[PDB]
Structure formats: structure tokens, C-alpha cells
Subunit: 125 residues, 5 copies
């Protein structure tokens, strides 16, 4: 069992990925929770949004219906906050490190080797 | 420790992925929120949908039961909006950049290299 | 800024992935919404499921408790429908196109080149 | 337009992926649903868990507060069930197939090719 | 049918990934549940947070509104626990195994081979 989980993990391109979804989900969850506790309430004190129209579904009930705009705006703001947080926390550093050329990846090293291979092959002739 | 987390992050084919799931979930969520606040209500002012039949679960309760179509239809519209949104915002540009050729990738460059190698090895004959 | 987001996207193996999660989550959501509105109610008019046993948690409350089977079954049905939908819509077409041989890919072209190289190298020797 | 969606789909390394997320979310949801309907109720009849302490938030309300264990354990059990399910349904078969050598992959065929090349390049010397 | 799903599965880069999303979502779900059951309550007996301001939406209702801070801190702590959990359970072992090199992967063997090839091509000169 320790062998199946561990042998699958050496195999575990899956491990790199599982972690990625783990962080990705954990983090999106954090930004939206901040938005709900801090932002949505702010949107709400004001709320001259949520308009409406009469709603007596002759199939379900009968009383009144609304169009909540504050929620949409609350969500839009949440979205922007995510883009700023990700781009700023993540993007400035990863893009800066790839430009200064200090980050890595399997495809890139293969390329260097393939390239070196090309050069030597060229030298033989 | 700072070493383990950072070393794992340059490693972060995972980083590319985590970000991808982060945006994918964040965005799908934004579209569904719009569908729910703006669209579901419009579907609802009408609502000649939600039909039903008697429901007295001789196992749970006893009172009445409903089949909501407005929700099914509201959900479907949400989906189309996502398909159009992803395809139009994401698809027209990425597919157009690949056809014109501007977007890049590790596999493609390896190909270029392998190809040149093939051409050279052929030249040696 | 427009340059940074766009340059990271050209970079975006991530874009391929983010899009994938977006569609995958959006679609699963659609299937379950159909199951809940059309199917669960049907399970429920019948609902001779949800059994139970007394439940007075001497730690939290005291009143009664139930085992909802209708939900378990509704979910299962939801699942089978997903399997029929993905396999029938996605699988019949991708397995049939790979069998007839018409789907291109970076890994496959590389193999072709690697193979040509092997053959040529064998010719020199 | 039909050309853009279809050309992106032949392209769909993404399709492979979307299907993966689609299936992954669908299945996990199925297990947790079984956990909730079947398992949680059982945890709950017993429930000598959920302990507590008075809770009158002088900032929000005022009355009493609880620490639920049955849920923590219910989730824990849900989790073990997922691991056994994924590992047993998924892991025994893919690890056995990779070991017996039947599940193929572009990366692996390339390896064989690279390996063969190494061997040949070596015979020349 | 058994052939199409199975043929698609050997094909299944998708299988590696789907399993990855399954484990990532399942695990994040577990961390947050622990936080909610064990942690949020602890945060709450205390709760001198959830501040507020009057809230009578001249568009929706009219009565009062709150900015729940406890939830924000509760979510943050949840996040740390995930970071600690993934890195400590996942990171120490994978980072250590790669350093000891005990861990294997198709990309890495490709590199070794590319290197040897580079080295041999270099010897011919
Ligand atoms: Au009734
Ligand atoms: Au009872
Ligand atoms: Au109390």
C-alpha cells in the first residue's frame, strides 16, 4: 500500500498537479471569503441596487421578485481582486524571474540539449 | 523551509497549473453569479414552469412536490453564456495566434529542433 | 500590463488548462442542475426511501434522524448520466477519430522525427 | 466560427483535460454525497461528539456555541472512502498496467527512441 | 464500449489528471471542514470581530448590516493549515525524493538520454 501510493507518486506528475489544484482551490476560496465578509457588506449598506418586478408564478407561488445588482458588482469586485492578487503576487515574480532567466522547466532543458545537439551535429560537417 | 517551498515553485509546472485552475474556477463562478442575479429573476418573473405532482414520502414527510424548469433553463442559459464567453474571449485569440503562429510552446520548439536535426543527419549522407 | 498578461498567455499552456477546468466545472454543474430539477423531484414523489432511526445526540440536541436514499440514488443517476454524456458525446468521437487516425499532436510528430533520426543514424552505421 | 470551435477541439489536449476535470468533479461529488446520506446520519445517531461552550459574541449575538466532531469525523470517513476508491478503482489498474506494460504514452515511446539512439550512437563508437 | 473507454484511458494523460483533481479537491475539502468544525467555533466563542453599520437597502429591505471579521480570520487560518498540510505532507517528501533522485519521470529519463547523446555526439569530435 505504501508502495502503491509511493510508486504512483514517483509516477506522480499527478502529485505536481494535485498540489496545484489544491492551492488553486484553497486560494480562490480565500479571495472570495474576503470579498464576502469585507466587501459584500460594504456593497450592502448602500444597496440602491436590487431592483425588481412583480412575481406570482402561476406554476409555483405568488408574491414578488427581485434583481440583485449588488451581488453582481460584489462578484465583479471579487474577480478584480483576484486578478490583482494573482497577477501581482504571482505574475510580477514569475515573469520577472523568467526574463532574468533563473526559473526552470523540463521542456526548456530538453531544448537546450537538443540545441546543443544541433550545434555539435553541425560541427561534425 | 523557504528553500523547499521556493524550489518546489520553480518546479511549478504546478504554478502554471494552480494558476490555471484559479482563473478557471474564478471565472466560471463569475459567469454563474451573473446568470443567477440577472437571468434567473427574468426567467422567474415569467415562471409558468415549475410544474409538479403530489408528494407524501411514506418514509420522510407528506405535503407536495415540484419540478422546476426555470432552474434547468436558467442553468442552461448560464452554460451557453460560458461557452460563448470562453470561446469568444479565449478561443478567437488563442486559435488565431496559433494559426498566425505568435503563441509559443516547449513541445513545438523541441519539434523544430528535432526537425533540424533530421535535416542535418540527412545531409550527412 | 496588457503586454504582461498577454505575454504570459502566449506562454499559456496555462490558457489551455484554465479553459479546460472552466468547461469541466461548468459542464458538471449543468448535469447536476438537470438532475436536481428534473430527476430528484421524480425520485421524491415516490420517495419510499429516506429511512431512519431515533436521534437525540447527548452532545448536541435530541429529536430524530434519517438516512436519505433518494439523494444517494439521485446522485448515482446524476453520475451515470455524466458517464453517458461524456463518453457518448466525447468518447465515441475521439476514440473513432484516433482509430481512423486524424488527430494531430506535438508528441506524435516528435516520435515521427525521433523515428526518422533513428533510421538515418542506423543508415550511417 | 464552426471552423474555430472544431479546430480548437482537434487541438484539445484541452478536451483530454476538460474530460478529466469533468470526471474528477463528478466522481468526488458522488462519494461525498454517499457519505452525507449514508454515513453522516449514522455518525449522528451516536453523536456523543459535538461538544461546546457558551457563546454570546459581544459583536454579533448572544446565546451558546458548538464544536462538531461528527462532521469532522464524517468528512474524515468521506476522505478515506475517496482514497480507497481512487486507489482501488484507479490505482490498482493503472499501476498494474504500467508495470505489465500496456498503458502507452508519447513520452515513453520517445524515451525508447532516445534510448535506441543512445545505443546506436554508442555502437558507432 | 469497454474498448472505447479503456482505449481512451491508456490514452489517459486524462487519468493521471482526473485523479489529480480528485485528490486535490478532496483534500482541500477536508482541511476546510476541520477548520470549520474545530477552528471557527474557537474563533467564535471569542468573536469581538463581526463589526457593522446600519443597513436599510432602499431597493431591497431595511434593518441592519455586518462585516464578519471572524470568518475572514477563520478562512485565513484555514489557508495556512492547507499550506502547512500540503507542504509538509506533500512537499518534504517529493522535494526530498527528487533531490535524492529516488523519484523518476519520463521527462527526466529523456534528459539523461539527451545528455548522453549530447555527450557522445561530442565524442565523435
Ligand atoms: Au400536496
Ligand atoms: Au425521534
Ligand atoms: Au449558551
Amino acid at each position: 500500500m505504501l508502495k502503491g501510493f509511493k510508486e504512483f507518486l514517483a509516477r506522480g506528475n499527478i502529485v505536481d498537479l494535485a498540489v496545484a489544484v489544491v492551492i488553486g482551490t484553497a486560494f480562490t476560496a480565500l479571495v472570495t471569503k474576503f470579498t464576502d465578509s469585507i466587501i459584500t457588506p460594504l456593497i450592502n449598506r448602500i444597496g440602491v441596487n436590487a431592483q425588481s418586478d412583480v412575481g406570482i408564478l402561476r406554476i409555483g407561488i405568488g408574491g414578488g421578485q427581485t434583481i440583485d445588482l449588488n451581488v453582481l458588482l460584489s462578484a465583479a469586485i471579487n474577480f478584480f481582486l483576484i486578478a490583482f492578487a494573482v497577477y501581482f503576487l504571482v505574475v510580477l515574480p514569475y515573469n520577472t524571474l523568467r526574463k532574468k532567466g533563473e526559473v526552470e522547466q523540463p521542456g526548456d532543458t530538453q531544448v537546450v540539449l537538443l540545441t546543443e545537439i544541433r550545434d555539435l551535429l553541425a560541427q561534425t560537417n
